[PDB]
Amino acid sequence: AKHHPDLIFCRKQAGVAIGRLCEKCDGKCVICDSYVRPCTLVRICDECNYGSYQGRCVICGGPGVSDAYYCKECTIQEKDRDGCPKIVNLGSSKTDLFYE
Amino acid sequence: EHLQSKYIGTGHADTTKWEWLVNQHRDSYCSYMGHFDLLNYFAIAENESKARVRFNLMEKMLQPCGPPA
Amino acid sequence: MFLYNLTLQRATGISFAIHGNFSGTKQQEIVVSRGKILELLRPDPNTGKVHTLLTVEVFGVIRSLMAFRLTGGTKDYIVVGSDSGRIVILEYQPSKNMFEKIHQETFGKSGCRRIVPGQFLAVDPKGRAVMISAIEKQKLVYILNRDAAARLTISSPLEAHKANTLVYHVVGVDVGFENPMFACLEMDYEEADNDPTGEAAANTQQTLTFYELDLGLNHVVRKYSEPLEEHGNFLITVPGGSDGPSGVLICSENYITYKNFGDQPDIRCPIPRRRNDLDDPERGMIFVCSATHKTKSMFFFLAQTEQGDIFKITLETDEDMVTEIRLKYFDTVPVAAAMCVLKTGFLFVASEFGNHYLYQIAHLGDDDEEPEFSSAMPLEEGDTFFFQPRPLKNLVLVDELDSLSPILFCQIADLANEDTPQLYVACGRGPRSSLRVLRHGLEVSEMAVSELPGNPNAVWTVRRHIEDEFDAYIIVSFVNATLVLSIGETVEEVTDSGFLGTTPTLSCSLLGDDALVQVYPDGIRHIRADKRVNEWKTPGKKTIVKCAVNQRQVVIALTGGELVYFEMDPSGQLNEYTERKEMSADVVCMSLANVPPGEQRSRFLAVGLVDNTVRIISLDPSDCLQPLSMQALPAQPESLCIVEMFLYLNIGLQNGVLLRTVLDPVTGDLSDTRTGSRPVKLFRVRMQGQEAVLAMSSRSWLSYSYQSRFHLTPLSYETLEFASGFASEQCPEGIVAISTNTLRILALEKLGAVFNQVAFPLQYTPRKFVIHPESNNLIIIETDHNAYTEATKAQRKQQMAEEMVEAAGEDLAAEMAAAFLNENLPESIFGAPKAGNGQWASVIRVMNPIQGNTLDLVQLEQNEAAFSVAVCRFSNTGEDWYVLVGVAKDLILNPRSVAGGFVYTYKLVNNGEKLEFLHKTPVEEVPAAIAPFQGRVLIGVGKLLRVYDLGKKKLLRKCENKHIANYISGIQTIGHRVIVSDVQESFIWVRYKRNENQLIIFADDTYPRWVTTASLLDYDTVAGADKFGNICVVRLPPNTNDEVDEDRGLLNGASQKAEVIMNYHVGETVLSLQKTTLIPGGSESLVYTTLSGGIGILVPFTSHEDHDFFQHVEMHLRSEHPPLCGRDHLSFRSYYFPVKNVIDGDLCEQFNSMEPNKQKNVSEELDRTPPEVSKKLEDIRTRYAF
Amino acid sequence: MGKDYIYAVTPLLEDALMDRDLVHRQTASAVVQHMSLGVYGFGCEDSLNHLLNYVWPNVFETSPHVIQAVMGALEGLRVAIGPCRMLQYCLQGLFHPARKVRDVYWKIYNSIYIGSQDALIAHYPRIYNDDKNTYIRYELDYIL
RNA sequence: CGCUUCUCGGCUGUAGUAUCUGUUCUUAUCAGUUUAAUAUCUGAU
Ligand SMILES: [Zn+2]
Ligand SMILES: [Zn+2]
Ligand SMILES: [Zn+2]
């Protein structure tokens, strides 16, 4: 996300598995986290979509509900043509809140 | 760091003149042979055929500016 | 301002060509890529022509194109790699006639980048995978399969990334149902960029690498990696499995090598050079095409060297090893980008410069006479393989497909005194260069022309039976007499045809299956084949003014306008209907629809009258002679014609205006175009196996359908009077048309194109030409790097003859030197010799632009190359013309080291027909831009702009400037101003003063451009085009005072920075811009002629309602109708600079090419109806251009 | 629809980007980003070139929020006014003596380069040859 | 259940920055580290 600056994306080669977003994350652009003008579907790589990891939220890791999307300002800047936008690590937020 | 390993041609705070210009020349050569019509224009300016111009460009992308310094 | 881009002539030069069963039938098709345009061509087997079936603008640059067949499949899908970061797999749907995009997979950012793939494209020959590859660092492998709906599916992209690696070519190695392998010519360059000695980059040989996709392990591994003893440029697949020795041929400079891994010893065979062709000081020879062929017994390759010498390459082999590779000189064809040899024995060559060709292979194999060559013949001393070239022996030319690429210079001018203007175009590279004249008309080929006495007012043409394939009678009606001619292929007047038209006639036809009718204003004569004259007299003393004839209906109108019907019975006689009507005025015209095949009478009848009204009347027997709907007209009707292909009524008036209505039991819309100052006469003509309508005015036009799209195009021919259809063995399908005192059997052979190309061939690549405005003649400078002038051709020929006598002629044959001397090879056919490097042939040719003959030819020296020409007339001397020619000397183009130029001054003495030398001034750099200015000339030396004036010894400078940057390439003046085009930066405005002689820079532009050519539009604005593809318009700010007399600049430049008011991407290097008016009755429009053959226009918008409507149309079409390659259309037009104030009309004119649900969606989003949107969408084109 | 309201709010952001408190500058830089991507391809490349003149001095800020807001604004103006204009701004700071300006100008050039690498080919400056190496792209320089 | 009188009331956690207030070196050279350049740091009189 852009709010949490320590989160890193997968950025490997994007396959054919369409990325999904959870119920808490619905409407968000993957890169921006803005809610308006979705234009392009999210294709996550094959390691980020394997077995138990299928149908899972791109940002969270929770159970996916809807399809994921890039906004139009990610489409026209071509931020959808870098890699798999699956946020890999869970770092320094929603972990100490679990510990609180 | 990770950009210049992954996306070639980027450059950093210590990029000399030769490295910047050799990335300039390699991107210029791939855009010459990529566009059809720049290759048309460079084939009219000689009498070389298009495959002669593409071989001449492709053999120059190895060391286009000269030996390093 | 707001512009609008239309393409009149689409691009014609071909970069890629592939072949295969794209329709899914037994016959094969070509699919070509014209850079921005993807077309499908069908090579018609019986008649040998090529017919375009579909032409789509993909709005990208198709960097590679390849067709592949799914395993156990009939259809071949097309695989497109482009400047978008997407592979896209297409399928030709022949039913809907479109390229349905099957698949589209994204892998990286867009544009012709160095890292992302798309440039190279290999496919497995079985059809199980596809590898799309970059020039550096990264490749991708898709795995294609077919799932249970017989539907194509792709896997995720595999990766085969290898850092610091150049890829010269990639190709699919055949392995029959084995793990698929791809071969590529890589090169690792990191040790070549680490060592400053410069020799480590001199021993860094290519590597043939084999990538093997493991379908079991789902990844790509480098299997084999073997170095190469010379740099190969591209590879050829060898078929394998059960067919042949599976491997990859490797072409290279002076060598062809079979290489295949595992056990084969590497087989080299040196390329056969010509016998003693005079172009090789030190120059090698590479292959440029592949053209594999698999004739179901053996397989061979039609390779082609860089001169054009097709070799037939064949492998002689044991069990699976190759024993030897052997080849022989197949033929010689102009140099091609791609060849597609077709099963059914055709060979299609796509010459990259000039016309493309389709040959029929006459003697394949060619295993009879010629000294064939082989790898295993133990020959030393270099090549020692010396074939002698010869004219065509194995191929015969069947079709020449026309093209204009490369358009190097163009003028819009009316030198031929025609009403419409003309396009005078330079074309070609090398000895195939040609000046082409283009008009808007259709090509009118005179099969036969006869003179007729008197003054004939009508003609008709009839057969004897309906089953007659050709005609048997021609009928000519003069003012007071008629004649009947007969065609026994030797046309003669006859007397016993049965007509006997002593009175003039109004019509004839073949009414019966074998029975005829004459209609004359004194009676109606049914003439059965057995010559039985059914005469019918006039009722009373009215005479028959008009008539409408059919197969099974006749309707005449007599004076006062009384309508009489006649039906053809199943008995075959004519029966008058028992109701007669006289209409509200006289009848000026009447017409009936042609009878359908199943139907037995024609339903509707249109009658035009003196009230300027046309009435439609049904003639079904329930309501015969009863009106349906009327239409008012502005002027007197003259002629009506009703056709289908969906019925249309075409109305030509007494002024030169044509209209069309749609037809049904009610009439519908209206379309119109001014054909014209003459009463328009309309005639049904059979054209291209369909119906077409010939309109007659001061110029004759033809309206004909072409894939549900009517083209109302004129005919490049004189004004005529009357016209009708024609068929014979002399002409299978033509027109019989009469003008003043004469008769013409003509044929319109080409019904596809827009322009009539007529070419006059030139010696070298013509740079630019000027127009001597008194007694119009073109003055062309032609200049080619790497080319001998023919004085040194003759000198080198005599020198090689002297050597062929002197080299041990004792034992003898000096016949060899003589026959070498006096047997020229046609350089337009066999390719010009290339004169090493830094040599420069050049001529100056004054040419009549009517007949196309060299009215004068002036050679130059060996390296003195012409670059800029101007005709002018000075003020210090009198009226006499002058020609200036900028010349250079020892120019060598890379690394750029000119040795100082000259400016030749000639006189253009006489009417302009010859060219006397006057003087020769030397200048210290190449004068690339000469321009007349206020009775003097302005010469751009290159960084130095000098005024010049005539002296009797040499040209004398009057001023100079030195602050203009890198290199001048264009000088254009509006009067008192100079627009100096830099070769890198931009337009630099310069003021010239009268009191002083200064040249003061007073404005420049902020962008860098690389301007090629430019054009003035207003006193302020300059439209320019650049090397990369764009078109900009630079308008000066409203103040920008010129009064600057003479240190800081503004940003290292001038002070009044000009501003840009459009930027637009075209996709080709636009090399000629001109403000003109292509159609009289139209308005001005910036015509651009690109380098890939295309011709377009940029037209302004009148009002904001038009501009806003077309903006919303194309803003909807970017959404509903995306381009084929996936390249975003806004981000294609905004390739280099972002787009500004230009609406792409090639996307707008794809509104007529969608399915009607999409058109209804967009049109209701526009709150109009789709015929009104298509009317509004073609109104701009017909108003501004063709 | 930002083609209609950009001339109304350009005198607002020109006042916000001159203000001392850097939250004004980070939020006005975000407005410049979204407005630049909203009027792409409509011919409003003059107002954005005006606002770039005020956005560009905030390059040397080191608060992370304002540096990512200004750098998002720069890579959102790259598509609006062109890679040529952003390369003219990024030039002559690429080889500045201080590392503190050299690395910021090199990372804005990296954003331009990976944003549009093909379009930069026409826009590169002409760099003359030194003794041992040749640097003039001669192929673009010659003319038919 | 109904009738009357009096009186009262209402109408947190997380990532990050910009500021004050607190306190600090008239060391002369030299050399090295370092910086855009000072500064800073390290030693011998
Ligand atoms: Zn986004
Ligand atoms: Zn991933
Ligand atoms: Zn979520």
Picking from D106, D137, D144, the nearest residue to B12 by CB comes out as D106
C110 touches chain A (CB under 8 A): yes
Supply φ then ψ for residue C793, to 5 degrees: -65, -45
CB contact under 8 A, B50 and C337: yes
How big is the B-C interface in CB pairs under 8 Å?
A: 135
Amino acid at B5: S
Amino acid at B62: L
D45 touches chain A (CB under 8 A): no
What does the DSSP assignment read for C519-562?
Answer: EETTEEEEE-SS--EEEE--STT--EEEEEE-SSEEEEEETTTE
Supply φ then ψ for residue D70, to 5 degrees: -70, -30
Question: Which method was used?
Answer: cryo-EM
Task: Using alpha carbons only, give the angle C582, C584, C589 rounded to the nearest 5 degrees.
Answer: 80
Helix (H) or strand (E) holding D96: none
Q: Is the distance between the Cβ of D103 and the closest atom of strand E smaller than 7 Å? A: no
Amino acid at C1149: E
CB contact under 8 A, B69 and D121: no
Give yes or no for a contact between C608 and C586, defined as CB atoms under 8 angstroms apart.
Answer: no
CB contact under 8 A, A13 and C105: no
Considering only residues 53-92 of chain A, list those whose CB is below 7 Å from strand E.
92
- What is the layout of strands, in order, in the sheet containing C473-477? C458-462, C473-477, C482-486, C492-494
Window 956-975 of C: residues touching A by CB (8 A cutoff) are: none
Number of H helices, E strands in chain A: 1, 6
Specified resolution (Å): 3.3
Residue of A nearest to C161 (CA): A13
CB contact under 8 A, A76 and D34: no
Amino acid at C945: L
CB contact under 8 A, D64 and A5: yes
Picking from B3, B15, B25, the nearest residue to D137 by CB comes out as B25
Say how many CA atoms lie within 13 Å of C374 toward its Cβ. Answer: 10
Give yes or no for a contact between C314 and C302, defined as CB atoms under 8 angstroms apart.
Answer: no
A39 is in an annotated binding site: no
Which of C119, C782, C1013, C1028 to mutate to probe the D interface, most D CBs <10 Å?
C1028
How big is the A-D interface in CB pairs under 8 Å?
A: 15
Give yes or no for a contact between C762 and C401, defined as CB atoms under 8 angstroms apart.
Answer: no
Tokens describing residue C544: 């028959």
D117 touches chain B (CB under 8 A): yes
Q: Which residues of D touch C1027 (CB under 8 A)?
A: 122, 140
CB contact under 8 A, C35 and B58: no
CA A75 to ligand 1 center in whole angstroms = 7
**End-to-end C-alpha distance for chain D, whole angstroms:** 44
The angle, 0 to 180 degrees and rounded to 10, between the axes of the packed helices D64-81 and D99-115 is 40
Q: Which residues of D touch A5 (CB under 8 A)?
A: 64
Dist. CA D83–CA D122, nearest whole Å: 10
What does the DSSP assignment read for C39-96?
Answer: EEEEE-TTT--EEEEEEEE-SS---EEEEEE-SS-S-EEEEEE-SSSEEEEEEEETTT
Considering only residues 109-128 of chain D, list those whose CB is below 7 Å from strand E.
none
Tokens describing residue C51: 């017919």
Min Cα separation C157/chain A (Å) = 6
DSSP label of C145: E
Q: Which nucleotides of E are covered by protein (CB under 7 A)?
A: 13-18, 35-36
- What string of H, E and C letters represents the secondary structure of C722-783? EEEEECCCCCCCEEEEEECCEEEEEECCCCCCCCCCEEEECCCCEEEEEEECCCCEEEEEEE
Top-tier CATH class for C3-401? mainly beta
Tell me whether strands C1095-1098 and C1085-1089 are parallel, antiparallel or unpaired: antiparallel
Contacts for C376 with CB less than 8 Å, ≥ 6 apart: C323, C324
Give yes or no for a contact between B51 and C234, defined as CB atoms under 8 angstroms apart.
Answer: yes
Under CATH, what is the fold of the domain C444-758?
A: Methylamine Dehydrogenase; Chain H (2.130.10)
Task: Using alpha carbons only, give the angle C441, C443, C445 rounded to the nearest 5 degrees.
Answer: 140
Spatial distance from the CA of D7 to the C1' of E10 (Å) = 57
Task: Using alpha carbons only, give the angle B43, B49, B51 rounded to the nearest 5 degrees.
Answer: 105
Give yes or no for a contact between C556 and C574, defined as CB atoms under 8 angstroms apart.
Answer: no
Dist. CA C385–CA C399, nearest whole Å: 33
Closest ligand to C-alpha of residue A80 is: 1
Query: In this complex, which residue's CA is closest to the C1' atom of nucleotide E35?
Result: D98
Tell me whether strands C507-509 and C999-1005 are parallel, antiparallel or unpaired: unpaired
What does the DSSP assignment read for C235-282?
Answer: EEEEP-TTSS--EEEEEETTEEEE--TTTPPPEEEEPPEESS-TT-SS
Closest CA to B9 of D114, D103, D138: D114
CB contact under 8 A, C928 and D143: yes
Number of H helices, E strands in chain D: 7, 0
- Is residue C262 exposed (0-12), middle (13-18) or buried (19+ Cβ within 10 Å)? exposed
Supply φ then ψ for residue C417, to 5 degrees: 60, 20
Picking from D80, D114, D123, the nearest residue to C1138 by CB comes out as D80
Spatial distance from the CA of C114 to the C1' of E2 (Å) = 104
Give yes or no for a contact between C27 and C42, defined as CB atoms under 8 angstroms apart.
Answer: yes
Q: Which residues pair with C769 in a beta bridge?
A: C780
Closest CA to A4 of C727, C334, C875, D65: D65
Query: In this complex, which residue's CA is closest to the C1' atom of nucleotide E14?
Result: A93
Q: Which residues of C touch A13 (CB under 8 A)?
A: 107, 140, 156-157, 159
Give yes or no for a contact between A80 and A74, defined as CB atoms under 8 angstroms apart.
Answer: yes
CA A78 to ligand 1 center in whole angstroms = 10
Supply φ then ψ for residue C1184, to 5 degrees: -90, -30
Contacts for C878 with CB less than 8 Å, ≥ 6 apart: none
CB contact under 8 A, A73 and D40: no
Spatial distance from the CA of C796 to the C1' of E32 (Å) = 73
A25 is in an annotated binding site: yes
